[model samples]
Target: MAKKVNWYVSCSPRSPEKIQPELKVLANFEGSYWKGVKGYKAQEAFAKELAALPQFLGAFSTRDRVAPMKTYGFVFVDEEGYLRITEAGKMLANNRRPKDVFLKQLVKWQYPSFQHKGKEYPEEEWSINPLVFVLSLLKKVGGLSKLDIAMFCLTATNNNQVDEIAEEIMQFRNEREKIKGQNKKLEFTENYFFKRFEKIYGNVSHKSKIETKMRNARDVADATTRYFRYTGLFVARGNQLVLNPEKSDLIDEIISSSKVVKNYTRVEEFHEYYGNPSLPQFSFETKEQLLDLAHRIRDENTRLAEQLVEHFPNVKVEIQVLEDIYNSLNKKVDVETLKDVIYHAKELQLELKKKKLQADFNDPRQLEEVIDLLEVYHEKKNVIEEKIKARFIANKNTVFEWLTWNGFIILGNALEYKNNFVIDEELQPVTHAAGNQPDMEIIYEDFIVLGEVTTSKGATQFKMESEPVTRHYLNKKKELEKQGVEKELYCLFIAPEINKNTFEEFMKYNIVQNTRIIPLSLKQFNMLLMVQKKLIEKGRRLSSYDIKNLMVSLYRTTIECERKYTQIKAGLEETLNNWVVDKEVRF
Candidate 1:
C-alpha cells in the first residue's frame, strides 16, 4: 500500500459573509460545527481539526485568510494562513526523506517566470521566487509564515542561490561571534573610557587650534639668527648682496670653500681666487645685524627687564596697623607702638571700605547677606582676639580662635576683592525705576561681579533681564563715573539651574565685560567651604595674644554681619519669589 500523505489543512471563506457549499458539506462531518462560522465556515472547521494532527503538522496550507482552502498545498498552515512546514510534511506523509521530497516537489511545481519573447510577456510573467511572492502576499495579507515558504522555495529551486545565501548567513554569524568574543575580553576603567570617548567625540580640536596659534605667534615674534658682512657699509650677509675684494685671502677662501655659494652668481668670482676652497667671507653690519650684535642688547635687556617688572607689578603691601597693634599687645610692646599700629590698621580698613563703596554693587539676596555676615563676623573676630589676649595668657592655645576669625576675614576679602556692583535706583529717570532697586553686589578687585539669585523661578526671569538690566547697569555706571567711581564691570549669573538654550541666549548680550556663569550646586558650596578652611590655616597667626584677639573679633563680626545679611537676603528672596509667582500667574 502507498504511504498515506499526512496532510494538515486550514481554510478561509471566499467571501467572508457567505458560507460556501463545500465548507457546509465538510462542517457536517464528526467533531465539526458551522453555526458561529462565516462564509466557507464548514471547510474552515474541517481544516482546523486536520491541522491539529501531529502527522499532518506540515501538510496543511491556505492562501492567506481569503478563501476556503483556495490554493491548497502540502504544508502546515499557520493560524494566520501563512508559513508552510514542507519538510516535516513530506517526511510524515510520504515516508520519504525530507531533501528528496523537497527536490521532487521543486520539479513538479510550475516555476514562475517572465516570458520576455511575447508582447505582454514580462507583465504576464509569474514570480516563481517564493520570497518575492511572499513579500507581495505580505503586502496583501500580513503574515511571517508566508516568508518561511518563500525561503524554502529559494533553497529548493536554485542550488547556486542556496549556496550564496548560506555563505552570506555564515559570514554574518561568524562576524557576530567575533564581536561577542571581543566584548568578553574588553575591560573597562574610568580613565580608559574617558580617553576613548575623548578620542572619539570630545572637543579637543578647539584647544589644539588655540595652542597651535599661540606657538606660531611666539615663534614669529622672536628673531633667531643674523649673518653680518662688510662692503664699506656694514651689511648683513644673508639680507643682501655684497662683494669682498678677491685679494682678501680669507674672503676668497671662504667663497671658494662654502657649498652654499656654489650656485651663487659670484661663485665663479670666488672660484677664480680660491679654486673652490670655500666662499669669500664678508664682514658687514646690517641694521638688523647691528641691532643683533650691538649694545642695543643692553637696551633690549633693560626693556625686557622693565616688561618683566610690569608683568609682576609691585603690589602695595598695606599693613593692617590695627592688626599689628592687636598683635603687639601680646609681645610686651610699648603702648605707643600699639597705638600707632591700631591707628594705621583703622586707617587702612577705612580706606579699603571707601574703595569698596565706590564700585557698583550687584549681588543676589543670598550673596548680599553673605557679605554682611562676613563683615560682622570679621569685627566680632577682632574683639574676640582682644579678649582672649587680655584675659587668658597661659590658656591662649585653648582660646586660640584664629581659624574662624581669619577664615571669615579671608572669605570677606575674597568676596570683596572680586568687585560687586549695583545700578543706582535713585538715578533712574522713569517711574519704572521704582521697580528696579540697586541689586545687591559683590566685587573682586578690578572685576565687577553682578549676580541674580533666583528662588522658585525658571530661566525666563533672568533671560528677560538681558536688555533692561544691561541698560540700567550702564546708566548707573555712567552716574557713578560722574561721581568719580573708577572700576571695571563684569557680569556673573547665578542660578540653581537654567535651560541650555536660555543660558546661551543670555551669553549673546554684551552688557558687561568678563562674564562668568556659576551654577550653585552643593559641590560648589562645599568647594567654597574647603577654600575658606585652607585660607584660614595658611594665614592665621599662632601667637597667644593674636589668637585671643582674633576670636573676639570673629565672634562679634560674625554675629552682626550674619544678622544683617540674613535680613537683606530674606527681603531679596521674597521679591524674587513674588516676581516669579506674579509672572506665572499672569501667564
Candidate 2:
C-alpha cells in the first residue's frame, strides 16, 4: 500500500491575522499547487495579497508531486504560519549551508522611486539597486546584523585582507572624505576595499571566500522580489510576484534611469585610470622614482635571462652580448641564419673526418703514415652498401578475399581490370650482408617502390643513388621479368625545392624504368599545416607539423647524402655539357 502523506494547509497571504492558523490547514495536501480554494475568487487575488505582505516575496509552480500538472504556491509565507518547505527552501532558511537560498537574504522594505529627464520626455524610475542600496544603507544605519554588515563590508573591501584594511579605515575615518586624505596611513587599504567591493558588488579576485559570497547573493536574487526606483515606483518583480500589467511600463522606465548614475561613475573611473596621463614633472622625488625604475629593470633582465635558458636547452651563449652588439650597431642580424651557419660547420667537420686529421696531425713526423692510413680507411669504407625490401601482407587467402575483408586494401578483384598504383616513402639498408637497416620499402601487387628524402649538405652519395636507385631498379626490372615477379619497379626522388633542370635530367636517366620526382613547395607545405590542424581538431594520433618540418630541415642539411649526390651530379653534368661531339657528327 502507498504511504498516506500528511497534507499541510498552504495558501497565499499566509498572515496569521488574515487566516486562522488551524483552519488554514487544507486536507490531503500533497504539496502547494494552484488548486482553487472554497472562499478564494481566483489564484491571482490570493497571490497579490501574499505579495503585499512584508514576509511574502512571491510564489512558484512545481511538478515534483505529479507527472504533467504542476502544483504552485507562494515562496515566502507569514512567520507564524505552518510552513511546508522544500529541501531547497530549507537550505535558504539556514544560511550556513552552501546550498542556494535566495529568500532568506532579501529584506522586505519599501524603496523610493523617481523620474529622470530624457531626450524625448521625462521618465519615471524605481530604485533599490538593491545590493548597492542595501550596502549604502548598512554603511549609514550602523546597527544591522553581522551577516548584513559582512555583506556590505565584503562588497566594499572585496577580500578578507581588504576587509581588515577597510575596518582600519573605518576606525580612523567614518566618511569617504577622511578616508581619501588618509591614503598613506591606510597602507594596503586598496586590497581590503577592493575585496569587500568584489564580494558585495562583484570585483575581481582569486579568493574562495569572495566567490562563495557572490554565488550566494546570485542564488538569493533568483527568488521572487521587487526592485523599485527612487521615485517610489516598482521597477521589476520576480516571476511569482502578482502584479497588474498596467504597472510594468512605469516600473521599467524608473529602473532604467536609476542605473545611469552608477554606470556613468564606473565608466568615468575606468577612463581616468586607464587613459594615458601626462608625463610626470621632474624633481628629487622623480630621481628617486627613476632609481626604483632602474632596479626593476635589472630584476626583469635577470628574470628574462633565466626564462631564455629554460626555454632553449641548447643555448650555451648568452643573448646579452648579441643584444648589446645589435643595440650598438643599430642593426639586428637574423639569429636563424646564424643557426644555419653553425649547423653547416658541424656537418662539414663530421663528414670530412676533421677529427681524424687532427689526431693524425698531432705528431708532425707521421704525415706520410697518416696519409697511408687515411687511404686504407677510405677504401674500406667505400665498400659499404645498404639494401631494403617493402611488402604489403594481407591475411586473406585470395586477392578477392583481401579486398572483401580489408577496406584499406585497394588493389584486388574489384580493380583487377584497371591500372592501379600505390605511393609511399621507403628506406633500405645500404649493404645486403652488412645488416645495414633498411629505411623503408613498399611492395605493391605489380611493382616494388623505394625512395628516400635527403637534405644532407656534405655526406657521400646514398647507396640507392650510386647503385640501387639508378642501376638497381633496371637490374631488378630484368630480374623480376625472369622470375615472373612483375617486371615493373619504380624509384622515386623527393627533395625540398629541387631545381627544374636537375629534375628533368633525372627523368632522362634510362636506367630508371619508372620514376617520379616531387619537390616540396610552399603550397604543399601549407597543405601539411592543414593536415596537422585536422589531426588536432579530430583528436587523432599522428605526428605533429613540427616533426614534419624538422624532417624537411634535416633532409636539407648540407652534410646529408642527398646534398653530396647533387654536387656529384652537377659536376658530371658540367663535364658532359662541355664534352666535344668530335669528327663523326656532320653538323
- TM-score winner: 1
Name the regions of candidate 2 deviating beyond 4 angstroms.
Answer: 1-438, 445-447, 458-468, 496-502, 510-587
Write one digit per residue (lDDT tens) for candidate 2, span 344-382.
332222212211222233233433332232122222222
Which candidate comes out best when scored by lDDT? 1
Q: Which residue window of length 10 is worst by lDDT in model 2?
A: 422-431
Cα error of candidate 1 at position 396, Å: 39
RMSD of each: 40.1, 33.0
Measured against the true structure, the TM-scores of the candidates, in listed sequence, are: 0.20, 0.17
Tens digits of per-residue lDDT for model 1, 1-587? 12111111122321111122232333234232323234246446556765554323324342243232222223322333332223323232433222222222222222221111123212133223222222222232222211122222222322223344444434533554565444352322222323432342333365565444333322221111000111111111222112222224423332233221121123223223222111122342233333332333333333433442332221122222323434654665543343333334433443343223222122234324333332332234456455433332111222222112222233343223211221111110000111232233444344343433332135564555444445545566666579776755433333334444434433333313322332222222223334334333454212223322322332233233333434423443343344334322221
